[PDB]
Design a protein around this ligand. Structure first.
Ligand SMILES: *[C@@H]1O[C@H](CO)[C@@H](O)[C@H](O)[C@H]1NC(C)=O
Ligand SMILES: *[C@@H]1O[C@H](CO)[C@@H](O)[C@H](O)[C@H]1NC(C)=O
Ligand SMILES: *[C@@H]1O[C@H](CO)[C@@H](O)[C@H](O)[C@H]1NC(C)=O
Ligand SMILES: *[C@@H]1O[C@H](CO)[C@@H](O)[C@H](O)[C@H]1NC(C)=O
Ligand SMILES: *[C@@H]1O[C@H](CO)[C@@H](O)[C@H](O)[C@H]1NC(C)=O
Ligand SMILES: *[C@@H]1O[C@H](CO)[C@@H](O)[C@H](O)[C@H]1NC(C)=O
Lengths: 192, 96, 96, 76, 48, 48
């Protein structure tokens, strides 16, 4: 096969959760590879939020570029993020009358919660070994007039569903040392 | 062929299983080649890395020749686009 | 929640009216909500749990902007299961 | 105010042990709690405990009676 | 304010857009306002 | 004539081909005539 699009950029659909939560940063993770599936060196990718380039983020030597769109005060609905690989030195000899540079778009939705509070889990893209307790991470925003001012302590309840049996349930309490944000780790005990 | 195993039990409904039994034919030669499977336009050297082996693991002296080419565009001709491209520029090399 | 033709679904919440002017701090506001959003009732009913909590979890929906959209079903799962599990690639039986 | 949370999966598997989690919170006085899987005739006894201080996030095993045909059941 | 063909009126304030979805506590709101209301500007500009 | 080939007329050795469309009983209004050179042996390598 004689190929023409030297550079390709893709959205690894393991991370990049489809619902965005106000005040919690929205992660964009992009894979950049050329020709026969090889990683690229330092390259810049443009993250256009709606119609304006804001990101201009460089890669991390393995085509794993990670950018954090700030989501606070986003009350839109559709919020179509697009990533493009713009460099006027590549060789992109397109064939089927498409765009003139590698491009990929993701279309997300908005998470609702009336008092204003959001819980996000930073998922895992690798299998977990048996017999090793693991520490999947959870981010949280807990706005004012929610749980109640004056109390710097919040408890999150924890549930794991293996096949159809609720197994390895837990409770994790956190002290709101800072104002409203942070991240706490679950001691998930993966067992056979 | 592909034999099929069927099993009926007092609890299960069908324990189907498959075979892939093939004729025990041993061609005296086997050539191993790993094509790049994708070549970019701005490349000048296409490398082929060919080997060949008997059934019982023996080198094979002989002549190995490779011929590689293509067509150009094949628009259609006549009331379409009469004269077009070439016969495809076909190159050829041979080695020992 | 649909298991063997059984809905198990509680009825939809009552639909608010789209013309009741409500005051916030500044201007005069009418209510509205899009058809497709995300909430706790849809991060459940996908894992398959059943909650009975009194606390508000489900999104509020205003009239004229209901779910509609018939049956919005995409690829929905990125499944890697299948059958056949073989191309031509005849690696004939080449060993004793 | 009292806030409660039931968690049991929507499709129980007949003949195998399952679990049920309950998350009572907010109450102050000691309380009496009951979780029942209302079968066709028989009642199940998932929880029948006296509730003692708040923050009662407890979860127990229960054994579903065997059934030959998928059936709807209620949990009270 | 119109005295002898002289407006003396300050220019109208900028017009907001009718589609900016804003959050209050519950549902999702669009902005609107009636043509005829009453405020301090019409409680004055009548006394003069 | 409109969508149907009716004439299929040959030339007269110097490219002056003359055909006579019969017009009796035409109560149309627009009547757009088109002529084409159809022979699947020539070369028309169009560009635009
Ligand atoms: C979101 O709304 C806009 C409104 O113009 C529409 O064009 C678009 O298709 C919608 N969906 C996405 C994913 O942007
Ligand atoms: C996961 O990370 C946390 C961070 O403090 C650590 O306490 C915990 O031991 C880690 N779990 C492991 C390495 O299994
Ligand atoms: C995980 O659970 C098993 C079973 O109770 C237990 O033996 C093991 O110690 C637990 N893991 C850790 C890190 O304690
Ligand atoms: C390759 O094969 C063709 C067959 O037509 C032959 O004409 C050509 O001479 C061969 N190449 C060389 C280098 O001889
Ligand atoms: C048993 O179940 C019935 C409903 O079938 C209901 O009265 C209550 O949950 C239980 N009653 C007794 C006496 O156990
Ligand atoms: C269920 O919860 C009760 C609470 O009193 C406890 O005594 C019991 O050990 C738990 N487990 C079972 C199997 O009953």
């Amino acid at each position: 096969m004689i190929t023409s699009q030297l550079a390709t950029l893709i959205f690894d659909y393991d991370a990049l959760k489809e619902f965005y939560k106000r005040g919690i940063p929205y992660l964009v993770k992009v894979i950049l590879t050329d020709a026969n599936d090889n990683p690229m060196a330092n390259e810049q990718v443009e993250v256009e939020l709606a119609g304006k380039t804001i990101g201009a983020v460089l890669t991390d030597k393995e085509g794993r570029a990670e950018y954090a769109i700030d989501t606070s005060s986003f009350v839109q609905e559709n919020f179509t993020v697009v990533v493009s690989y713009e460099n006027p030195h590549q060789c992109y000899y397109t064939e089927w009358e498409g765009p003139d540079f590698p491009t990929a778009q993701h279309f997300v939705m908005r998470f609702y919660s009336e008092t204003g509070s959001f819980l996000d889990i930073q998922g895992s893209s690798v299998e977990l070994n048996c017999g090793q307790v693991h520490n999947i991470s959870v981010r949280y925003i807990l706005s004012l007039d929610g749980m109640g001012e004056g109390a710097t302590t919040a408890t999150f309840y924890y549930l794991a569903m293996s096949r159809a049996k609720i197994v390895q349930h837990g409770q994790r309490d956190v002290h709101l040392n800072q104002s409203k944000s942070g991240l706490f780790n679950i001691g998930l005990n993966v067992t056979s | 062929g592909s034999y099929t195993i069927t099993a009926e039990g007092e609890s299960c409904e069908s324990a189907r299983q498959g075979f892939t039994v093939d004729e025990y034919i041993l061609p005296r030669f086997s050539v191993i080649v790993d094509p790049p499977n994708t070549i970019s336009i701005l490349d000048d050297i296409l490398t082929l890395n060919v080997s060949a082996i008997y059934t019982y693991g023996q080198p094979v002296p002989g002549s190995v020749t490779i011929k590689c080419c293509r067509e150009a565009s094949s628009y259609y001709g006549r009331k379409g686009n009469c004269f077009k491209g070439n016969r495809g520029i076909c190159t050829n090399i041979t080695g020992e | 929640y649909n298991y063997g033709g059984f809905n198990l679904e509680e009825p939809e919440p009552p639909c608010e009216d789209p013309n009741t002017v409500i005051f916030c701090k500044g201007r005069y506001y009418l209510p509205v909500s899009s058809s497709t959003e995300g909430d706790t009732y849809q991060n459940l009913r996908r894992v398959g749990l059943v909650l009975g909590t009194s606390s508000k979890i489900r999104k509020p929906v205003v009239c004229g902007m209901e779910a509609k959209f018939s049956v919005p079903r995409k690829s929905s799962g990125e499944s890697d299961f299948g059958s056949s599990l073989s191309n031509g690639h005849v690696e004939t039986l080449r060993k004793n | 105010k009292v806030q409660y949370a039931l968690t049991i999966p929507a499709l129980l598997k007949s003949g195998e042990t399952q679990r049920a989690c309950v998350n009572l919170i907010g109450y102050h006085q000691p309380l009496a709690l009951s979780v029942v899987l209302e079968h066709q005739r028989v009642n199940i006894s998932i929880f029948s405990e006296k509730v003692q201080p708040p923050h009662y996030f407890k979860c127990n095993k229960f054994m579903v009676p065997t059934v030959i045909t998928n059936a709807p059941d209620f949990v009270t």
